[PDB]
Structure 1
Amino acid sequence: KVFGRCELAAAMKRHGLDNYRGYSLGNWVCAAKFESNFNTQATNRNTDGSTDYGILQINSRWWCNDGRTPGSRNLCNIPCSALLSSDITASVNCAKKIVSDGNGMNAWVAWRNRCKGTDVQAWIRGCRL
Structure 2
Amino acid sequence: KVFGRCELAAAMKRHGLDNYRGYSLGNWVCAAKFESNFNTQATNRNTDGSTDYGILQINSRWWCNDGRTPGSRNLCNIPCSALLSSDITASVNCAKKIVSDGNGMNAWVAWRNRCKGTDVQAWIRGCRL
With the shorter chain as reference, the TM-score category is over 0.9
Q: What per-residue deviation string (whole Å, max 9, x for no partner) do you get for residues 91-115 of structure 1?
A: 0000000000000000000000000
The ranges of structure 1 where at least 4 consecutive aligned residues each deviate by more than 6 angstroms after the TM superposition are none
| CA displacement at 1:72 relative to structure 2 | 1.4
Using structure 2 for the length normalisation, give the TM-score: 0.99
Taking the aligned partners of 2:43 and 2:22, their CA distance within structure 1 comes to: 28
Taking the aligned partners of 2:100 and 2:7, their CA distance within structure 1 comes to: 25
Q: Is there any run of 5+ residues in structure 1 with no aligned partner, and where?
A: none
SS of the residue aligned with 2:92? helix
Taking the aligned partners of 2:47 and 2:123, their CA distance within structure 1 comes to: 29
SS of the residue aligned with 1:122? helix
> For this pair of structures, how many residues does the alignment match?
129
SS of the residue aligned with 1:86? coil
Q: Is there any run of 5+ residues in structure 2 with no aligned partner, and where?
A: none
Taking the aligned partners of 1:113 and 1:71, their CA distance within structure 2 comes to: 28
| CA displacement at 1:85 relative to structure 2 | 0.2
| CA displacement at 1:48 relative to structure 2 | 1.2
SS of the residue aligned with 2:112? helix
Using structure 1 for the length normalisation, give the TM-score: 0.99
SS of the residue aligned with 1:40? coil
Q: What per-residue deviation string (whole Å, max 9, x for no partner) do you get for residues 10-67 of structure 1?
A: 0000000010000000000000000000000000001111000000000001000001
Taking the aligned partners of 2:111 and 2:56, their CA distance within structure 1 comes to: 10
| CA displacement at 1:68 relative to structure 2 | 0.3
| CA displacement at 1:71 relative to structure 2 | 1.0
Q: What's the Cα RMSD here?
A: 0.4
Taking the aligned partners of 1:60 and 1:44, their CA distance within structure 2 comes to: 11
SS of the residue aligned with 2:52? strand
